[model samples]
Target: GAMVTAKKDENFSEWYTQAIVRSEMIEYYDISGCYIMRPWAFHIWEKVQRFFDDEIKKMGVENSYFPMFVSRHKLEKPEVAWVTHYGDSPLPEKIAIRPTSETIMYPAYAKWIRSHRDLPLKLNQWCSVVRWEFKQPTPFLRTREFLWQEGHTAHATEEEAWELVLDILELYRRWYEECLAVPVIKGEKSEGEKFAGGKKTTTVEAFIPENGRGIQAATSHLLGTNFAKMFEIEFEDEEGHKRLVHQTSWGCTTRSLGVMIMTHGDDKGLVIPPRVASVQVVIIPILFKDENTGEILGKCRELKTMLEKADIRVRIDDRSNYTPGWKYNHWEVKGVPLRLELGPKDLAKGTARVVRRDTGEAYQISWADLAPKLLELMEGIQRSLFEKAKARLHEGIEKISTFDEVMPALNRKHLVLAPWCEDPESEEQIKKETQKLSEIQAIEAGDQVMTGAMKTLCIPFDQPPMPEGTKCFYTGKPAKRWTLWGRSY
Candidate 1:
């Protein structure tokens, strides 16, 4: 009986909550900004981990674990939670939780790398970190404690460090596009948006059609020699010289679950992409008053086994108390990719009724061809979702020159692809002026939705030429590069 009350187009924030919570992917916890990830959502994370873990293993990266509790002296910064007391007694020195593990891990790297044989050391850990976010927290998007995989790798040369950064970035792109069916823009983050203290950062950015917001899906950062210098991670070269290691750190978080939900979910509830859906197919039995109910139930169970043998995740709904209609609605809300119905009529005809969640297409397939047809449908659904999101992303980007066209384009739910001077001051001016201008308009119209500032999302690596006299959108200087600007989550 759980249903989404708010329409996605009308109230995206409310609809998003209902879709995720009602679908049983997340639960509200007693502590604020912390959520309990139910098994439904955890399965998605596991699938992503399985694929990504294998790929990194192929690249000769080994898995490792680090302590979550960090000494205050080891950590030099905030947005970090601290344990000031144990039970009821106040500790002499407050211990801080890790906001990131660079400080904790690099010290070990310094000791381990005494020679050039240990030049390139790569380690990744699947863990959670604590960041006390002051902004309003969204369930999976901005939770204080969430799950992620942080990868830290060291290379002998700067060029090798750059190579791993891009290699990891490309894997992130595949994770989003191939696994999640979410299209992404592979680009380089600007100075204003790159990870602090990193020389350069490459990212995979995704757009949500419901709000025209660009999200930082994943990032691979080139740390150069910053952390090595701070941690004194020196290695003796074969030529008999000491050198600092070039490093890279990259990560993708559970916030990606939020992006997938926002991009593909509709009024019907969540529309899970086939590749990551925990339950790829559901088999249900339809009963009639005089029909053999036991036979129908047995047949559904048999079909479930058959699909499972084909390496598909399948389930059966054979609750005698719940009506067929109720089971249908429940699975639909849970976003099962495909459904198969078996009844006296379909059983007698030697066929089963197949239904698709993505497009709501229904038809009949013979029992002999059911397995192969279902597999084909799953592939189609995955491809269809990606194509749809890709098209929406294309439609949501608008090229503009004049500063005046920015707001109008934004109002139409599009990210502005404008020429920029690539200066921090100009980026600052654009962010400040856009908020000021947007606020005045919102106040005059008695609306509050259009009031957030715009920032540079990324400077795409696929550059379009800046011809003669190309001017910056906000600054009156000559343009430097094309930057995608938008309000983000």
Candidate 2:
């Protein structure tokens, strides 16, 4: 009764704000665009970080840190420094807070190398970065101060650089697929959507049904020789020839947690995936029968010990302050993957009731088989979440063949799938033409599709040759690819 009362479908904004809080993942902060990440949220972050950190380490990537503060100028289009003017104090040296680490790290890369032996220099930093955004800030999705990992790798050749780019993208995909239990579509960003000051950008796109939109799960950018040239990150080849090393920068942020939350969360609350769930299993000792309370309570304690020994992230809710129903709703909202109910009936029957968070499926497992079933049961929860999310993702797509269908399709909450011509009729061209179409239809110019509206989530990489001889949805020229267009957080 001490939690939020907003229904997820009725008031999504309040529901989200309430869900994140009641689940004890985050707390609102005094500053806008900034929130406190509680243990429930932080632990899952640590899980993702640990998985990614370990994977990169095995691939010979070294952990490193760069100062959050950067110098005042971008080498290519360096602008005059913005200085505070007040009688309080005069500034000494103007510095810019980094939105991302490209400028700060590449200069170090330029200085750290000399020969080809130092060719594939891979370094990853797990830290928070600042972005003073003016847009409406959602707690985890978009914040001024948020945590993320930025990995920059340099290789002697373009092929080697792109290999790392795709490699990291796959890692991002794996985090979503296996750990977070969210299926994402991997695709290259359109010219208008690619990371600025980079050659090509690839991303993993995730869908959220609550908002009827898709999220850019992660991105890997083929930075080409742009930064290398700007920062002069160069090295000597085996033949003693000095050249700019091809570079790649990739990052997946805490937004991944937001995606996981939005995908699995329901009216009850969050449904964290087993892999990312901080507390995968919660044991509640039902104490309704006073005669057999000790026996049932002992079984719960024993079960907790056993699951602990088996290395399951388990917890026992034995506080007498709340009833079993209270604890059930509490754990359900917190999104623990599995909830084990041990009561007198279960003890007498030599069984424990197992309830899953994702589907609300309940079944009975014998007391003797509790420990053996914990891991398997937890993993089943993970798989179900993945499959469930995948189904929603596929069903969420809006496949449209013509320009006329674009606006109406977007309004109907579709991921706006339309044919795109890469050669001449790029996503950029469609966006421009769509702006005019919006005017003709008396719609606002730049009518967005999903999360934001007019953005192309990504040019989906998984395709079957684009249905040979198809024409562009907007331009009517020969079509190139099918792009997923949506508005997202």
Candidate 3:
């Protein structure tokens, strides 16, 4: 049966790939590195878009569009960072598809801003970006083309722009935490990992379970008048003085859905939180010998209508050919948060069987109380799933002090929290020994569980810290900040 094959413990990666395909979420496109998001998957994207659109709109941000292609003339602006990082692609006139839109949009901002009244211009674009990545594509994770929401804002003061950057970063953290039900570690990206043109970049990193890798779920950047200076986006201040507009651009992409999939999904398939699941509740009508099929189907339809009126996404599976067991398996693999099983017996008893997808818990609720009961159940499911994910994250992380301990953690797919003496060469040596594990710096002080000799700790997103105060893992030097380090996907 499909449910048997979708088991989450057997083989995580294969089960995930199969569940995605079997649930009709997405399919590979004609292009090798792209996918066509099927309606099932696209519906989830729509839900996300609607929720975030409302949030950004509350902040007075207006949505807009811009050209995808950037000509050589515009791309060559001195203030705009040269496209050296993207050296893989070649164009006739060095035209580039926007990995981002600062260069393309700021030129227009320059024309629009003439006075202080236009000082706090805020706009956003919901669009697809193209970055020619050479790595093997993983549907939503590594796709060369993916959907994202990019917001551009210009402020009159540096303090205001910086505050906006942090504001948006915190908003992103909350979105991941509250809306998506995913916990994240917030931090500033190192110079090596910072966005190419951003003066400083802040990110919320979501942990992936399949491999103990930190996926940068979202980013907010402080441009600090770089693009404004390049495009001459100047405005007359309240003091009647000409000043370059301080700018910020922040974005979160469809890759976040991919992270969610990897984080909470088990061997069975995608286990989406009820908060983000496209269809939170699915009703399957059960038909049996000598049962009142007509009455059963009618009750299912009535329940679906009630759910719809309450603004809940609901579906009634009354397909004539498929058996009730088959439909149950189908919805289970699809990870519907709540499944309502109704038959002649259930209708006659004035109750329906409710099964939760995340934990497979089941109970019977009276038909008269179904609406309110289901609403409460949905919220409970969301909270339970989030707690389960948090617990898994805790289990998968470990503290290590010596190089000898690193290999075992990596092999077991555990993120190692370790300290290193601070130095670039020592970082290189650690990478050489461990085959380029990503290192993230840990700025805050904590207990040194592995070795008292440890000075700096690093994680999987940045390089290892150098040897400064103590003997370098490779060279002896003084130490720096403790950091976290691990292998990443």
Candidate 4:
């Protein structure tokens, strides 16, 4: 389609918007940084929600909802007031739309816990939050308002809460690596980089090789009684002493949808993972003869039903007005994992042609194995996409032993992996060092949170065994850990 005329790598911004709009995943809304999530995109979201909600429920977490408007006085923080009651009349206290739900949920946690029996009060909400934005919204990526599931839990001790924080991080890791076929690095954010009120933060860091930058796909924070103390979420221990409950909060945003697209998409269009794709397979019947129209369509629908019986998501594009070629273009543009085409000739031969959207590779499959084999092929595509992304991730990280190597590596869209002391003071010096480079010659980057060029993305959990002599890359002092430092979104 003309909307997708620009190449993905040549012009990523235009291509991303074109890919989303042409695929009918989103429609631009009247307000800036807000877009209508069309059914095509929402279906993919449901895939994530269904899996995550089921898993969390199995862990004894109950599903629930809370009021959208939260009291400004209750939040104890400055926020944009978004709604009111009736046409004019309203409460004296201004309300802010729930930005993250922490302030609103903790107070209830305070009321719910009374004894050690109430330990591990795990709860989650599948909801939308509004964080008003002034920047332009990239569909599925950056927006003022988006959807996410936030999990908050309280435990009797800091040890229990910290372990639960790691558990939540693994949950988000699978959501990306397994469901969305995006590989990520498990890591912890630096001091200034962690959540404002959280004691420590863990995350799944994803790499976007298209732009050569990192994306924070998901996060889990150890609240460490911070919120519990502020909100008075407490319980009585076996010793009959009242104490604050340790808390943890974790969440993943719709920015992940953009990450999924950016991870697997191509010059042709968006390449969706089979597990999360709304339409994993689309069947097109090429009717060459007027007499065989009914027969071709009959075979297509029969195949569709057989695949459905296997619990596969499939669709039959039987629009008579559009030619078979047009239908193929439509489905391919939308990044359906597989396309099955059965024409008068193919049907007579008891065969169907399968086209993979990722590579435009086509093959002929025996009608006998057609339905069952589709499952294998779809999974194969999903596995291959993830492996390719994983390889890109590994290749983009440059491990170094000196400070001078950082800028050259980051300038090339590669992340610097180096030994760090993990001290906020030294980390501050690194942030300042990056700022001085901005005046020399600006590096292409995105959402560089603090000083703009680069800072610690996370202390990656994956590491080669450090030798005894290891020292900080910059300070030449004792090193505490390995850090993944780079520009990020």
Best-fitting candidate, scored by lDDT: 1
lDDT of 1 at 277: 97
Worst-scoring 10-residue span by lDDT in model 3: 447-456
TM-score of each prediction = 0.97, 0.92, 0.85, 0.94
Model 1 C-alpha lDDT per residue in residues 1-489, reported as the tens digit of each score: 798889999998889999999999998889999999999999999999999999999988999999998888888735989999999999898988887888889899999988879968999999998899777788887779978899999988999999999999999999999999999998888888888888999998999877777889999999999989989998989887999999999999998888888888888889999999999998988988899988888888778888888898998877788888888888888889898999999989989998999889998999888889899999999999999989999999999997899989878888999898888988888889888887887778887433378888889988888899999988868998999999776
| Index of the highest-TM-score prediction | 1
Residue-level lDDT of model 4, residues 164-278, one tens digit each, is 8898898899999999999989999999899989899999998877666787899999989888888988899888999999999999888888899998988878899999998
lDDT of 2 by residue, 385-455 (tens): 88988998888887888878877765655688888776433555655665565466545443332223356
Write the candidate numbers in order of decreasing TM-score.
1, 4, 2, 3
How much is the lDDT of residue 357 in candidate 4? 85
The worst-scoring run of ten residues by lDDT in candidate 4 lies at 442-451
Off by over 4 Å in 2: 74-88, 292-294, 423-452
Q: How high a TM-score does candidate 2 get?
A: 0.92
Question: In candidate 3, what are the lDDT values of residues 197-261, reduced to their tens digit?
Answer: 67877777777766566567888888887778788999997788999998999999888777777
Residue 348 lDDT, candidate 2, scale 0-100: 80
RMSD list, candidates in order: 1.4, 3.2, 7.0, 2.6
